[PDB]
Design a protein around this ligand. Sequence first.
Ligand SMILES: [Cl-]
Ligand SMILES: [Cl-]
Ligand SMILES: [Cl-]
Ligand SMILES: [Cl-]
Ligand SMILES: [Cl-]
Ligand SMILES: [Cl-]
Ligand SMILES: [Cl-]
Ligand SMILES: [Cl-]
Ligand SMILES: [Cl-]
Ligand SMILES: [Cl-]
Ligand SMILES: [Cl-]
Ligand SMILES: [Cl-]
Lengths: 16, 16, 16, 16, 16, 16
Amino acid sequence: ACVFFCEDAAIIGLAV
Amino acid sequence: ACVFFCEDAAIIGLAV
Amino acid sequence: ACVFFCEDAAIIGLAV
Amino acid sequence: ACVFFCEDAAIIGLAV
Amino acid sequence: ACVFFCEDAAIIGLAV
Amino acid sequence: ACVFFCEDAAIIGLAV
Ligand SMILES: [Cl-]
Ligand SMILES: [Cl-]
Ligand SMILES: [Cl-]
Ligand SMILES: [Cl-]
Ligand SMILES: [Cl-]
Ligand SMILES: [Cl-]
Ligand SMILES: [Cl-]
Ligand SMILES: [Cl-]
Ligand SMILES: [Cl-]
Ligand SMILES: [Cl-]
Ligand SMILES: [Cl-]
Ligand SMILES: [Cl-]
């Protein structure tokens, strides 16, 4: 698994 | 929800 | 389709 | 853009 | 790599 | 966080 990142601005990581 | 980005090169955002 | 990237640190692309 | 589903148990949709 | 499905209504697959 | 499913054929889950 690895961490994707999105913009909310804050950086949010999502583990997949 | 937040915006993930991919490479197409252009930057494309995808709202999730 | 486009390439999203995650952090594993290594950069990993994922085609979608 | 569409609704993906995941099992949380309950089934939840996710607008991608 | 596999086929995820979403409801668009029709069910559509997505090769991830 | 939940389990998404994809068709690989077998059905596989993916913890997102
Ligand atoms: Cl912030
Ligand atoms: Cl997470
Ligand atoms: Cl461009
Ligand atoms: Cl979008
Ligand atoms: Cl490395
Ligand atoms: Cl890939
Ligand atoms: Cl929709
Ligand atoms: Cl949602
Ligand atoms: Cl496949
Ligand atoms: Cl596709
Ligand atoms: Cl879970
Ligand atoms: Cl998994």
